[PDB]
Design a protein around this ligand. Structure first.
Ligand SMILES: OC[C@H]1CNC[C@@H](O[C@H]2O[C@H](CO)[C@@H](O)[C@H](O)[C@H]2O)[C@@H]1O
Ligand code: MG
Length: 359
């Protein structure tokens, strides 16, 4: 199991039988800012199980994230990909993404099932409304108190024998560096540094200039998230050498995010510019190759199951309806991306075993 390979995991899917209603599979078509443009594209909620908010179709169907057999299947697939860690998309209790329901209540179950398969769970902190240094303090404290003692709780284990929680902070750049500094510099007014609630906070870098904001904020690392090559400075693998150099100079953990492709036009039908064909696995292999070449401390995978954005490595199957041919992994198997991940994970694990100064 590669504990240096993390995958972004989503637990926001629901269906009538486990949740009382569809959740996320019935995603609305997101309106283009200009309504003159939006009126020429599809509108309304998708109607599962045959019409879902994805360009692909899952082997598990329009599944529920709180179905314990669904959680087991996922853990199996990640383990067989030899991914050691899932970075769980997280909103505070009673809070949710704008298209979903609360998910914190499911964390205990996900941890238990992760333990069953010797996987670890870290936290991908989403941009909840009014998120700032003060409530981040409370949420970090909450996460660590509530889940820190579970044996599947992820800690980056340094060779010195210390073990640090990790937090990926999505759209971290929305909050000012001076506000982050309160929480993440040693002498910040509400510093968690050197406290029992200390950890490794990874910031999202979009634009090159965010490098400098990230330093000022006191983050421990950077990740790039987006699966589309060319969409941002960070998501363009041609810039990963430079980010790596920068991170080395400033003692930051560089965590490139690699995806198998991208397509979100079932919910953002205006966003065809960012669509990337999977090329039967070659897009993913180029991404993985590009990441390995930088010799990174960790690699993140976008994503296990972000089905809306077509970045999932979860098993997908052919499906055709009266008006739709879903994308799929033909001519390969539903497990193609799991198998390609296992291949490159083993490469990474071997090569990473020769990075160390002590050899
Ligand atoms: O986890 C970080 C990031 C990944 N991309 C999707 C982001 O959520 C947003 O978009 C999805 C659809 O792709 C919506 O369902 C969510 O409501 C929205 O917040 C997510 O934050
Ligand atoms: Mg060091």
């Amino acid at each position: 199991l590669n504990n240096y390979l993390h995958v972004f995991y989503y637990s926001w899917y629901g269906n009538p039988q486990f949740d009382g209603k569809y959740i996320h599979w019935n995603h609305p078509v997101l309106e283009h800012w200009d309504p003159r443009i939006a009126k020429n594209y599809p509108q309304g909620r998708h109607n599962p199980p045959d019409d879902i908010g994805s360009s692909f179709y899952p082997e598990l169907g329009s599944y529920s994230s709180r179905d314990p057999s669904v959680i087991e299947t996922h853990m199996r697939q990640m383990r067989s990909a030899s991914i050691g860690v899932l970075a769980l998309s997280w909103y505070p209790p009673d809070v949710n993404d704008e298209n979903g329901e609360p998910t914190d209540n499911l964390v205990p179950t996900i941890l238990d099932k992760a333990h069953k398969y010797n996987l670890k769970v870290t936290f991908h902190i989403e941009p909840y409304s009014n998120r700032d240094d003060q409530n981040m303090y409370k949420n970090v404290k909450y996460i660590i108190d509530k889940y820190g003692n579970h044996p599947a709780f992820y800690r980056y284990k340094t060779k010195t024998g210390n073990a640090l929680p990790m937090f990926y902070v999505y759209d971290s750049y929305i909050t000012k560096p001076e506000k982050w500094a309160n929480l993440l510099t040693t002498s910040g007014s509400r510093s968690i540094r050197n406290s029992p609630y200390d950890g490794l906070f990874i910031a999202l870098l979009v634009e090159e200039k965010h490098k400098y904001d990230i330093l000022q904020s006191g983050f421990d690392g950077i990740y790039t998230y987006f699966a589309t090559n060319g969409f941002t400075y960070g998501s363009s693998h041609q810039n990963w050498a430079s980010l790596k150099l920068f991170c080395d100079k400033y003692n930051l953990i560089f965590i490139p995010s690699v995806g198998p492709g991208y397509i979100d036009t079932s919910i953002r039908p205006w966003n065809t510019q960012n669509t990337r064909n999977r090329i039967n696995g070659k897009y993913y292999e180029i991404g993985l190759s590009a990441a390995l070449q930088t010799r990174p401390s960790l690699i993140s995978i976008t994503s296990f199951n972000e089905w809306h954005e077509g970045t999932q490595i979860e098993k997908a199957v052919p499906k055709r309806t009266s008006n739709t041919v879903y994308l799929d992994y033909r001519p390969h198997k539903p497990g193609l991306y799991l198998e390609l991940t296992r291949k490159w994970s083993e490469k990474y694990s071997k090569e990473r075993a020769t990075y160390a100064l002590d050899r």
